Design a binder for this molecule. Structure first.
Ligand SMILES: [K+]
Ligand SMILES: [K+]
Ligand SMILES: [K+]
Ligand SMILES: [K+]
Lengths: 687, 687
């Protein structure tokens, strides 16, 4: 069901959640002065979510969340990334540098305090009401000086909500000794990772396991061997009961951003500039890279990761545009604003209509600038590798060595000048079609002026004459440098020129953000006064939220249905030993052959892998705990389907799903692949 | 349900069909001396099936069955292929040249007659028992001379069944005045034709409509304006009732071939030679053609149809190999033979085991020859266009003009020498890898002997020096011919050489067919004696058969389900104006926008397009009538899904489907797109 809800909003949603199957008492989910299930949810390393699952501080998160830590502890000799890692006793758990887990100890509405303090600011158009600096000053003031000394490991922050109409103060408890406990092999943690990115059905065992360490009274402490596991105030019980179609499910985590209060003019802008340009430009770049990778197996090895990276936001854009085209996104936002405008007229209050028209005006006014910026960003800054070639400055020589370092990083083991030329020719062709001469970065005027419109000639010239055009040409330069040659170097001139245009566009565009922000404060205030907050969630902003719904599949298209649950049978169907992403771990294969599923499979002997649910999630919900009607953990959220990515603007009940690793599968992999029984023994596994 | 059943087998199947929902009395479906629904089924133009659907001789078949006739009547001015054709009165229906519809008037078991006549042949290894010549002589003898003069439009044929263990005599009634009445536009008749070939879900309105004309007493007659519509003895009533999941369905038509009595050694041969080679070689050829078509829009236009043609049997091979790998085809055939062998031992009869071992021996013995033949056939004869360049023979000049005609047909508006070179280089690379020097067509030895292993050099030389290497080079030749030059021409020598090897392989392989055939007579006799015919259908052989089952979807893979029914919503989802195969006709679009579905949609207002069923069909079932439990027409068969193509060897209950145009959609397109009300009025449309 729709919405990423504040914890303060639980009372307002509780009836709707019970109608969907919630059985918990409200107080047990969240409450302000006691212990609640909220106390088992953590912000894992500043972006991802995780969850406490034992009375000795075991934390579950996604493999993709744990990846960097697993990587860091890997050596080609103990390659934990590839083989999995299973500590067989607490003493074998691996400390990590610059990691943290954050608990949300307390939440308090401070809207009256902040609004009163804002009256001091004379200028009605000051943006201090959204300023992190300003808000931190208010938080610090409110908590007292010495707060910190009287509160081991606690800090405070104030955040804006509802466009500046509501403020909460959070009290955070931060732990920095968080040790790696367990991880599956990558073939399990990243199964289908690229090819199945954004896809349901999904077959990835995307998990990893950490443990919070602390002082002997459970306070935060920097890493020390005298530290001991945290004995947390609350942890999740783990359900063995599984899921069935239509079961209630809920998620708590830290979603980053949403745009629920877009005007119709902002939807049209997101379609026709940001998405349309990203889709066009990336389809060009990718098409060239594909052709090259298919022609040459060394190019495949060099460019596969850059290709997959480009594909990630491309696939998102595709999905968003599908939603705008087929699911009525614009009309939804149009109806929202027409309702408020007609109401405002009844109240004799034209300020809401003025706000919408101000947003409309600003969006109209920036259109050509924003189009220029997205063209350069997608076409060149991200599009063309040689845009990010070295730009100098700067008797010696030390500077040559400094340039050499940047050059080697540019033209590294994954870079092909020949691939980059082909990509640049195609990208610059489209770029020059769309951007008129008068608005080109200056160096690109040379295509018309010096090369007679021949982009291939132009790009061939940059590489022929640049000191960065090849290692040979770099070495000839240093060796025998020239100040001179460098000042005129066509690659340096290209790179300088495009980054100059990028910067100027950025700087001209930035001022347009503020009138929109100011107008949205008024717009959202309107919407709330008129209809209330019960069916109007605040946009995500990296803070703790809950969402609820049901375990359920969907129909992507006529006569096709995806169910709610994948199985280990589906892993085996996808097996491909010659594709790294569809390798099946030999222990798991052996498990499937023997049906050695223990107590983790369903009564018909099918072993679950993942499931999907109608919860409303976005980026920042990776790793989030998925709870059943009684608050027990039934899975770990890891993705969302491409059909649903338009959900950041308008929730799509019939298409949008969260993609979730089944906790039964997590347990299976712990048990049968890891052989880490002690982790099972320390959890409270319930029927 | 499994099987393509003889009409004589209806009694044996009738209980199983009733358990699936059949409500008809047996006699009304088929009977030997009266009128039955069998009398409404026709063999349409010697391969396809069709059905009589009015009392004035209206015949429904597939668009793909009618295509050639529609094409022939099209001029660029009246382009019926593109716009549809709808005759608005009988006088406007278009006669066709060299067309026929065949009714199966009578069927008679003649097994005793044929076996008695075969005793005359002294040689136990004579293949007269399967000879069309020999069998026609027996048919002619049995019917009497003068049969024909005493029986307007009737002819007789005898066919072998069950490997020569059963013989039927058919009495055929042939009509040759069959006029085009109606056809949808191609965008409807071929919607998704290439991209959705072998695919369910499917959205194609694949139909066309003819009318049988005859003399005034309804006898066959060649085309004349005095001819009148046939008043047939039986026609299908058309149901408006629709279909629902699990409804009974049955089909009658003329399936071509199946291989239900393969030994396990024959399955392994079909996998490892015929399919594996076809998949490998076509994936090469297609990969090259794709790369070229994507690079160049004129090449796309020239090669798209050749690419789609290659893809047709490729996709089939893929599907068959999937079935051999995942669905147990070999083990099924292994179990069949082990059952018979163990039974034969109990009966003191070793001849069944000897038969299986003889088939095994023959398959082992031909393995390298058959591998060579498939390599040359897939790699070169079909693989490389210049294999089919002109080979001469032959004061004038007339012969030059004859060569010019063949050359122009070779290097036509769809041929690119540059594409053909690239394909040849890749195909010949794989070919030379697989076939050792000693077994090469002689000219290809030159790659090692004259070009130092360089296939590109070799192919470049053929085109450089051949008189067929370009139009320029052809014109220089004739102009100034040379006998001489032609005798040495490297393309002519290549073409001669490969066809010589092809022919020699073919001739050496042919004798191996007979011992297998002879052994299969014995093998099948065994199987029938042991278990009877109730669950052992005779292989298809182009004769009239029935099949039964239910309206039902399937799960292609874990967590995905395809339903039983597509809708017009699915057509609209696939719309793409810039792809000829996904163009939506403007009248049909307008129908969908207005929901102008008349009485043809379901009670929820969704308009059906196609459905699928568990019937057992193959090539020759195109156009076949699909009947409900009461014998009413509910659809027209048009394809089968790729998952099910292994069904020619072993029926796959959980995957194999027939793909069927919903008759409700046929009516809709007649009515709302064609505007051909009189065709509706002449049918007997029942609730
Ligand atoms: K994703
Ligand atoms: K987001
Ligand atoms: K087909
Ligand atoms: K067949």
């Amino acid at each position: 069901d729709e919405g990423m809800w504040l914890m303060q909003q639980l009372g307002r949603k509780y009836a709707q959640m019970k109608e969907r199957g919630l059985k918990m008492k409200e107080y047990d989910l969240y409450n302000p002065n006691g212990t609640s299930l909220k106390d088992a949810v953590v912000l894992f390393d500043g972006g991802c979510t995780g969850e406490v699952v034992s009375d000795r501080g075991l934390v579950l998160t996604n493999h993709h969340c744990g990846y960097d830590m697993i990587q860091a502890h890997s050596t080609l000799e103990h390659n934990y990334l590839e083989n999995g890692f299973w500590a067989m006793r607490e003493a074998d758990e691996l400390p990590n540098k610059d990691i943290s887990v954050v608990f949300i100890d307390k939440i308090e509405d401070v809207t009256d305090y902040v609004k009163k303090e804002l009256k001091a600011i004379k200028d009605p158009n000051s943006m201090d009401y959204l300023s992190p600096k300003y808000l931190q000053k208010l938080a610090d003031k409110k908590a007292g000086k010495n707060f910190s000394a009287k509160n081991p490991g606690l800090s405070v922050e104030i955040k804006a909500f509802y466009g500046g109409n509501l403020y909460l103060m959070f009290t955070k408890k931060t732990y920095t000794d968080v040790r790696l406990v367990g991880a599956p092999p990558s073939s399990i943690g990243k199964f289908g990772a690229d090819t199945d990115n954004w896809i349901w059905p999904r077959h990835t065992g995307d998990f990893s396991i950490f443990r919070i360490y602390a002082d002997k009274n459970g306070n935060p402490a920097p890493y020390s061997e005298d530290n001991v596991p945290l004995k947390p105030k609350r942890f999740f019980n783990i359900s063995l009961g599984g899921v069935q179609e239509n079961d209630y499910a809920m998620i708590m985590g830290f979603p980053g951003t949403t745009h629920r209060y877009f005007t119709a003019s902002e939807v049209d802008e997101w379609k026709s500039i940001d998405n349309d340009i990203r889709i066009r430009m990336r389809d060009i770049r990718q098409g060239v890279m594909l052709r090259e990778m298919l022609a040459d197996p060394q190019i495949k090895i060099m460019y596969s990761a850059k290709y997959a990276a480009s594909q990630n936001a491309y696939k998102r854009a595709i999905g968003a545009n599908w939603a705008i085209k087929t699911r009525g996104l614009r009309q939804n936002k149009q109806a929202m604003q027409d309702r408020l405008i007609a109401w405002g007229a009844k109240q004799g209050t034209p300020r809401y209509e003025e706000a919408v028209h101000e947003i409309d005006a600003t969006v109209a006014k920036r259109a050509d600038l924003r189009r220029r910026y997205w063209m350069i960003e997608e076409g060149i800054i991200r599009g063309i590798e040689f845009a990010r070639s070295p730009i100098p400055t700067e008797a010696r020589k030390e500077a040559i060595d400094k340039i050499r370092t940047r050059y080697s990083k540019f033209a590294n083991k994954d870079y092909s000048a020949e691939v980059d030329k082909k990509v640049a020719v195609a990208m610059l062709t489209e770029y020059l079609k769309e951007i008129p001469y008068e608005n080109l970065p200056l160096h690109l005027r040379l295509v018309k002026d010096r090369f007679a419109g021949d982009v291939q000639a132009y790009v061939d010239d940059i590489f022929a004459r640049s000191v960065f055009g090849s290692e040979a040409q770099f070495d000839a330069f240093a060796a025998v440098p020239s100040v001179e040659k460098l000042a005129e170097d066509p690659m340096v001139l290209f790179a300088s020129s495009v980054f100059d245009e990028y910067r100027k566009l950025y700087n001209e565009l930035r001022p347009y953000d503020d009138p929109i922000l100011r107008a949205q404060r008024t717009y959202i205030a309107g919407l709330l006064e008129m209809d209330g907050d019960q069916d109007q969630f605040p946009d995500a902003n990296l803070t703790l939220r809950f969402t609820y719904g049901q375990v359920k599949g969907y129909s992507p298209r006529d006569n096709v249905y995806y169910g709610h649950q994948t199985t280990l049978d589906g892993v085996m169907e996808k097996e491909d030993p010659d594709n790294w992403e569809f390798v099946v771990d030999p222990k798991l294969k052996a498990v499937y052959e023997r049906k050695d599923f223990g107590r983790y499979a369903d009564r018909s002997g099918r072993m679950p892998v993942a499931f999907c649910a109608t919860t409303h999630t976005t980026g920042g919900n990776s790793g989030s705990p998925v709870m059943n009607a009684n608050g027990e953990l039934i899975g770990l959220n890891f993705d969302r389907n491409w059909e649903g990515v338009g959900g950041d603007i308008q929730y799509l009940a019939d298409y949008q799903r969260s993609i979730i690793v089944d906790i039964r599968y997590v347990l299976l992999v712990i048990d049968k692949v890891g052989g880490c029984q002690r982790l099972l023994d320390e959890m409270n596994i319930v029927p």
